[PDB]
Design a protein around this ligand. Structure first.
Ligand SMILES: [Zn+2]
Ligand SMILES: [Zn+2]
Ligand SMILES: [Zn+2]
Lengths: 376, 86, 78
């Protein structure tokens, strides 16, 4: 049935995105196997965890424009509103679909408004900041001249369109394809800005080793991100030949050190039928809401589960000792049993009483709407 | 052993810039409410109060110009007929 | 017992226990029962909002030094 508020979110992504499961089916089945899930959400602790992991997923699909069913993705929205999902959430996602359209029209336009890089080498995408983006923490990176010179040029293009607006560049979500002349051949690499930054930090010293400390200076990427990004380039999963050959091996990015040395693997190349391809193209993406963010909500979401758990337990504890208690009397001593745990808030309480009423733990009296009875 | 950009997908976030001049019409911060929305109660007319931009590049509130079109149909500053911009 | 941790119960009463990072939770529930009358079956241990599985170790749930484990009784357990 699937219980995890997250695994649930991960299934919708599996269905809406170009994966095996979604190509091995048809719009009817899919629409069906989707309709099924939103129904089960009515039975999930805090629906927000599902919203969080869902929006995130959409963003990935929307941006990398790898949505399998462009029709549903939209439609997915209303069924998402229909089931009951919050207000500001639904239309907010909707606003996201509206931007890719507003953007296509805006890209097609920008490209023509000029006949840095070749016309169709650059593709823009301007999205609402309140809708999309979440955690806003300055993230710094050194852009190679090519990209840097484009930013302002696009910045002015939007200017004579909708004044009173300012673009804020999103390097996490931006991506592109870069060539990679190796010693075995030339290949196309699909990457995020951060990676472009790390790789390009070799251009002026093609065959030189660069330590972790220097990359921190050449790329500006804060320590953490650098670690992930490098790891993403020395250990990309399901990849036969890696792009960057690091030095003292480790099993985790956390183990990297100032002295750690990195170099452009000259023996890189794809393979097709145990035959070494000289021309190839691979993808190295799938990024997120800056790492520090991940640790943020988790840290809290865990605490919430714990309060919920304690609240839940504390109720049935009073309920066990006494047997027939009133909302009134229960509210007050609910605060004392959790005296050395935390002060339960009345919303959390209300919700767990409901939760305990359907899972048949507590029952309301016919004689008194309030006043609960400890059942079974 | 170059690494050269071959295709770039730039992504930026749309955000309302900060304007620091005043509405030459009601004489209030363009970013705040107008003299109307300020006092006049809530209602079906208490609709959002945005700013407007014209082909003359000046920018007054939205209501403070509306009440300036049922009549004088030129921009009070550069006397060149009013014309909006999206 | 190289790893000295503690289990907090509903009342806030903390209980200290000596274990090894290879010790299984199924055994902690036991060392908890030898210290307090609580039977393993009514025990649900919660570390970082996540529930510990019996057939797993403290090492798995990245448990450390004075790390606090939450003993939340079962509803259907007394
Ligand atoms: Zn005004
Ligand atoms: Zn107004
Ligand atoms: Zn004017």
């Amino acid at each position: 049935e699937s219980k995890c508020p997250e695994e649930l979110a991960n299934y919708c992504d599996m269905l809406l995105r170009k994966t095996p499961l979604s190509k091995k089916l048809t719009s009817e089945e899919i629409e069906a196997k989707l309709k099924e899930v939103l129904k089960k959400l009515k039975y999930v602790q805090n629906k927000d965890v599902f919203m969080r992991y869902h929006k995130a997923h959409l963003t990935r699909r929307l941006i990398l424009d790898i949505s399998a069913d462009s029709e549903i993705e939209e439609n997915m929205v209303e069924w998402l509103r229909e089931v009951g999902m919050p207000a500001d959430y639904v239309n907010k996602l909707a606003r996201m679909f509206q931007d890719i359209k507003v953007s296509e029209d805006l890209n097609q336009a920008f490209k023509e408004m000029h006949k840095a890089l070749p016309a169709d080498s650059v593709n823009i995408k301007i999205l609402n900041a309140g809708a999309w983006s979440r955690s806003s923490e300055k993230v710094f990176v050194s852009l190679p001249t090519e990209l840097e010179d484009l930013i302002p040029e696009v910045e002015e293009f939007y200017k004579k369109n909708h004044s009173g607006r300012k673009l804020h560049w999103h390097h996490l979500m931006s991506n592109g394809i870069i060539t990679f002349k190796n010693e075995v051949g030339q290949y196309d690499l699909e990457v995020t800005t951060f990676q472009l930054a790390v790789l390009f930090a070799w251009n002026q010293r093609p065959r030189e080793k660069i330590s972790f400390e220097n990359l921190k200076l050449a790329t500006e990427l804060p320590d953490a991100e650098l670690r992930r990004t490098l790891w993403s380039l020395v250990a990309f999963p399901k990849l036969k030949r890696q792009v960057l050959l690091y030095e003292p091996q480790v099993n985790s990015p956390k183990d990297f050190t100032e002295g750690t040395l990195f170099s452009v693997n000259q023996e890189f190349s794809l393979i097709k039928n145990a035959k070494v391809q000289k021309r190839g193209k691979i993808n190295l993406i799938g990024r997120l809401q800056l790492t520090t963010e991940r640790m943020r909500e988790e840290e809290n979401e865990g605490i919430v589960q714990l309060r919920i758990l304690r609240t839940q337990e504390a109720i049935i504890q009073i309920m066990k000792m006494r047997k027939k208690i009133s909302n009134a009397q229960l509210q007050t001593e609910l605060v004392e049993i959790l005296k050395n745990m935390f002060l339960p808030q009345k919303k959390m309480i209300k919700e767990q009483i409901e939760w305990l009423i359907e899972h048949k733990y507590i029952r309301r009296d016919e004689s008194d709407i309030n006043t609960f009875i400890y059942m079974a | 052993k170059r690494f050269e950009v071959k295709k770039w997908n730039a992504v930026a976030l749309w955000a309302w810039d900060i304007v620091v001049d005043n509405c030459a019409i009601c004489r209030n911060h363009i970013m705040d409410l107008c003299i109307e929305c300020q006092a006049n109660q809530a209602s079906a007319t208490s609709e959002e109060c945005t700013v407007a931009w014209g082909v003359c590049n000046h920018a007054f509130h939205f209501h403070c110009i509306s009440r300036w079109l049922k009549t004088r149909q030129v921009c009070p500053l550069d006397n060149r007929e009013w014309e909006f911009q999206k | 017992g190289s790893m000295l941790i503690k289990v907090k119960t509903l009342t806030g009463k903390e209980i200290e226990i000596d274990i090894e990072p290879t010790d299984k939770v199924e055994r902690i529930k036991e060392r908890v029962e030898e210290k307090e009358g609580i039977p393993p079956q009514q025990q649900r241990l919660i570390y970082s909002g996540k529930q510990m599985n019996d057939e797993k170790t403290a090492a798995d749930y990245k448990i450390m030094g004075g790390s606090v484990l939450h003993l939340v009784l079962a509803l259907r357990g007394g």
